[PDB]
Amino acid sequence: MTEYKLVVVGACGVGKSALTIQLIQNHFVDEYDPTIEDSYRKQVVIDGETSLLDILDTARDQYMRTGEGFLLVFAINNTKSFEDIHHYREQIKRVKDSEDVPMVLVGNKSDLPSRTVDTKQAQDLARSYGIPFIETSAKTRQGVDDAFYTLVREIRKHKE
Ligand SMILES: Nc1nc2c(ncn2[C@@H]2O[C@H](COP(=O)(O)OP(=O)(O)O)[C@@H](O)[C@H]2O)c(=O)[nH]1
Ligand SMILES: [Mg+2]
Numbered sequence: 168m169t170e171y172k173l174v175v176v177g178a179c180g181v182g183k184s185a186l187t188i189q190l191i192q193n194h195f196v197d198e199y200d201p202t203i204e205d206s207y208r209k210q211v212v213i214d215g216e217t218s219l220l221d222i223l224d225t226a227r228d229q230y231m232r233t234g235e236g237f238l239l240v241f242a243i244n245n246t247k248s249f250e251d252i253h254h255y256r257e258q259i260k261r262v263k264d265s266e267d268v269p270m271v272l273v274g275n276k277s278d279l280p281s282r283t284v285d286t287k288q289a290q291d292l293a294r295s296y297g298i299p300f301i302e303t304s305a306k307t308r309q310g311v312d313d314a315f316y317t318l319v320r321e322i323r324k325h326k327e
Contacts, residue, residue, distance in 0.1 A: 168217065168218075169216070169217075169218045169219070170218065170219045170220075170221060171218060171219070171220055171221070171235055171236060171319055171322050172221045172222075172223070172230065172233055172234050172235050172236075173220055173221070173222045173223070173234065173235070173236050173237070173238065173315065173318055173319075174222075174223045174225065174230045174231065174234035174236070174237045174238070175187055175222060175223065175224050175225060175237075175238045175240060176225050176237055176238065176239060176240065176255045176259070177225075177238075177239060177240030177241055177248060177251070177252075177255065177273075178241070178245070178247065178248040178251045179201055179226070180201065180242070180245070180248070181240045181241055181242040181245060181248045181275055181276070182240065182242060182275040182276055182303075182305045183224050183225060183226070183238075183240050184196065184199040184201075184203070184224050184226070185199065185275075185305030185306070186238075186240065186273070186275060186303060186305045186311060186314065187207055187222055187224040188207075188305075189305050189308055189311045190207075190209065190220075190222070190311055190312070190315055191207045191209050191222070195305055195306050195308070201226060202226055203224075203226055204223070204224065204225055204226040204227065205223075205224055205226075206221055206222060206223045206224070206230070207221075207222045207224065208220065208221050208222075209222070211315075211316075213316050213319050213320070214316075214320070218319065220315070220319070222315075228262075231258075231259065231262045231263075232262055232263075234259075234263075235269065235322050236268075236269040236270065236271070236318040236319070236321060236322045237255075237259050237268065237269070237270045237271075237318075238270070238271050238273050238314060238315070238318060239252050239255050239256060239270055239271070239272050239273065240273045240275055241272075241273070241274060241275070241284065241289075242274070242275050242276040242279075243274045243275070243276055243277055243279070243282050243283070243284045243289075243302070244276055244279050244281040244282060244283055244284075245276075245283070245284075246283045246284060249274075249284045249288070249289070249292075252272065252292065256270065256296065267325065269318060269321040269322045269325045270296070270298045270318075270321070271298055271299050271300075271301060271314060271317050271318045271321060272289060272292065272293040272296070272298055272299065272300045272301070273300075273301055273302075273303055273314050274286070274289050274300065274301070274302045274303065275302075275303045275304065275305060276304065276305075276306075277302045277303055277304045277309060277310070278304040278306050278307050278309070286302065289302075298321070299317050299321065301313050301314045301317055
């Protein structure tokens with residue numbers, strides 16, 4: 168019965184869309200229009216509780232204001248995208264007017280061998296933020312459920 172508005176943010180090309188589509192449609196899209204910004208709905212069950220997810224895949228001022236949780240996505244083979252995380256976080260903090268916003272740090276493209284962002288680096292950032300860090304591959308589906316479900320768990324602990 169509960170609904171959760173989730174927002175997926177991060178630099179262009181990190182796999183925001185691919186991640187969202189795997190969760191929604193259960194397949195990996197190789198070439199999804201980089202400019203398309205849209206929301207996707209799905210009824211899920213998480214730790215036994217039924218819930219409707221409304222997920223904005225950015226590429227809206229509305230979702231920022233009404234978003235209850237955010238995935239901060241970088242790709243592990245894109246140092247610049249990891250360096251952009253702080254900016255995304257501060258922007259959310261500003262709009263939401265809080266310092267306790269539910270967020271999850273997501274390191275995507277974990278199947279790729281060209282790693283330039285150490286796991287240690289990401290974990291150290293997430294620790295400073297007090298948020299979970301989850302490694303994912305939209306391509307193999309590794310960690311996809313875990314990223315979204317973890318965010319939902321962070322939302323629930325926050326409003327409780
Ligand atoms: N190898 C690999 N490629 C990915 C992964 N996620 C996304 N991609 C590719 O990276 C490119 C951009 O992905 P996209 O989802 O559009 O990124 P977005 O701009 O953040 O929405 C596309 O070529 C995707 O196929 C992943 O986990 N592994
Ligand atoms: Mg996209």
